Design an enzyme around this catalytic site. Structure first.
Site, mmCIF file in Angstrom:
data_model
loop_
_atom_site.group_PDB
_atom_site.id
_atom_site.type_symbol
_atom_site.label_atom_id
_atom_site.label_comp_id
_atom_site.label_asym_id
_atom_site.label_seq_id
_atom_site.Cartn_x
_atom_site.Cartn_y
_atom_site.Cartn_z
ATOM 1 N N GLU A 3 45.342 35.556 39.893
ATOM 2 C CA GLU A 3 45.195 34.785 38.725
ATOM 3 C C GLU A 3 46.621 34.640 37.790
ATOM 4 O O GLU A 3 46.812 35.330 36.597
ATOM 5 C CB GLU A 3 43.719 34.915 37.351
ATOM 6 C CG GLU A 3 44.025 33.741 36.262
ATOM 7 C CD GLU A 3 42.744 34.223 35.853
ATOM 8 O OE1 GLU A 3 42.684 33.540 34.608
ATOM 9 O OE2 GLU A 3 41.011 34.613 35.955
ATOM 10 N N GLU A 33 35.811 35.339 43.940
ATOM 11 C CA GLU A 33 34.662 35.854 42.424
ATOM 12 C C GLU A 33 33.330 34.843 42.785
ATOM 13 O O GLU A 33 34.943 33.600 41.933
ATOM 14 C CB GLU A 33 36.097 36.271 41.929
ATOM 15 C CG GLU A 33 37.134 37.291 42.130
ATOM 16 C CD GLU A 33 37.853 37.117 40.443
ATOM 17 O OE1 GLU A 33 37.346 36.896 39.289
ATOM 18 O OE2 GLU A 33 39.089 37.697 40.738
#
Length: 436
Positions: free
Chosen positions: A172, A335
């Site tokens: 990210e 995730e």
């Protein structure tokens, strides 16, 4: 309509090194940003070492990895995602030779996974950059950190060329815009332009990630090096066109990063965002070709919930279609899960039907997106074993199929207990999703 997933679907779970490993000062490992953030990435850092930092001990995965990986194999994990601690290989971050004690641990970890035929999915940098690079160079706003990361990436690529085939460069990158200390190792001095420094660091992260794709493909020929974005699926609160444009703009806050990583260039809508703000980005010649010639092989992403602009299992189907329609590249859910409070019963069990419902509904919608034709490599739920949360450095918000006896004040026996979701996921992987 089929009830089974594609053959070879990479079922498993995902953690991060600083959230489970512990042993933060073992084997010469240096201090990371997590080691000085005792209250999570969403809260200010603290270098006093006066408060309890749960990241320092984690769940002692560094010493308990053989038992924990055996539990992952008991569920039948096809893949397991974790991160290589940058500080274990380069304590200060700018050393020329790597740390042999750090590389040897991940030899043992990756060997343990391959004992059970579990594919390692390795994030190279996951919110744990060396604190030495922050104090010495000023973080990712310095171009020298690119050389340190490229050296770090090359080191682990050669060391694990025979063991790890699935890599992700950064977890990210967008985190640099929300938590600049963890995302890019940034602190804003007096008079320093904040938006400039953050997007300057994002560019260096873009270039460093493209260099890792180039180095990864050169060193490991059959390797698949992917990106990682946090999906920001946003719906318009009203059918008013101003809210439709607002939802589009909020989704672009993340698609910009996957645009650069997967398509290979700064998208056009960022030229005006940089102009309408005071954002100027120093760029080196040849950076544009590095970004375009070394696009990532797949798009790893996370998903937890929808958002609105003015719990959602169907939203993960919208996200999978939206990402695949735009990029036409293999995707990877790296995730996903439900954090919630667990209660240990009198008989020692954990009846987490609430977590089973979240995972079952989201996976039923994942199977629909696959039926839509989306190319999905696998699915690793977040924290298959209870870990220290990234946002607040806590244990109470539990994601695991496996319960860890440790609370928010660090107390507990650290023993592992199979929750009810442990056996439910074991059947899901066993039937390849048919038992959903």
């Amino acid at each position: 309509q089929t009830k089974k997933f594609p053959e070879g679907f990479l079922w498993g779970g995902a953690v991060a090194a600083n959230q489970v490993e512990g042993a933060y000062n073992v084997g010469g490992k240096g201090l990371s940003t997590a080691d000085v953030s005792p209250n999570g990435v969403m809260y200010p850092f603290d270098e006093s070492m006066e408060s309890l930092n749960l990241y320092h001990e984690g769940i002692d995965f560094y010493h308990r990895y053989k038992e924990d990986i055996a539990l992952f194999a008991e569920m039948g994990f096809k893949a397991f995602r974790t991160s290589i601690a940058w500080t274990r290989i380069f304590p200060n971050g700018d050393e020329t030779e790597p740390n042999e004690e750090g590389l040897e641990f991940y030899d043992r970890l990756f060997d343990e996974l391959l004992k059970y035929n579990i594919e390692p999915v390795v994030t190279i940098s996951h919110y744990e950059m060396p604190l030495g690079l922050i104090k010495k160079y000023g973080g990712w706003k310095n171009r020298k950190v690119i050389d340190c990361y490229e050296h770090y990436a090359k080191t682990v690529f050669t060391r694990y060329k025979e063991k790890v085939k699935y890599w992700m460069t950064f977890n990210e990158i967008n985190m640099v815009l929300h938590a600049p200390f963890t995302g890019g190792g940034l602190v804003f001095e007096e008079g320093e332009n904040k938006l400039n420094a953050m997007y300057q660091a994002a560019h260096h992260l873009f270039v460093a990630s493209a260099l890792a794709v180039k180095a990864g493909h050169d060193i490991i020929p059959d390797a698949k090096i992917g990106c990682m974005i946090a999906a920001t699926t946003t719906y318009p609160m009203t059918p008013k066109p101003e809210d439709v444009l607002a939802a589009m703009e909020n989704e672009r806050r993340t698609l910009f990063f996957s645009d650069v990583q997967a398509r290979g260039a700064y998208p056009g809508y960022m030229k005006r965002f940089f102009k309408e703000n005071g954002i100027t980005i120093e760029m080196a010649e040849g950076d544009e070709d590095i970004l375009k010639e070394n696009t990532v092989d797949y798009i790893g992403f996370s998903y937890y919930m929808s958002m609105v602009a003015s719990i959602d299992p169907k939203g993960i189907r919208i996200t999978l279609n939206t990402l695949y329609d735009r990029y036409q590249k293999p995707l990877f859910i790296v995730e996903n899960g439900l954090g919630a409070v667990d209660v240990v019963e009198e008989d020692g069990s954990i009846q987490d039907d609430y977590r089973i419902n979240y995972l079952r509904d989201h996976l039923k919608e994942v199977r629909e997106a696959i039926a839509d034709g989306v190319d999905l490599i696998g699915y690793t739920s977040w924290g298959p074993i209870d870990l220290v949360s990234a946002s607040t450095a806590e244990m109470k918000k539990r994601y695991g199929y496996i319960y860890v006896d440790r609370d928010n004040e660090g107390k507990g026996t650290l023993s592992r207990t199979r929750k009810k979701s442990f056996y439910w996921y074991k059947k899901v992987i066993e039937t390849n999703g048919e038992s959903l």
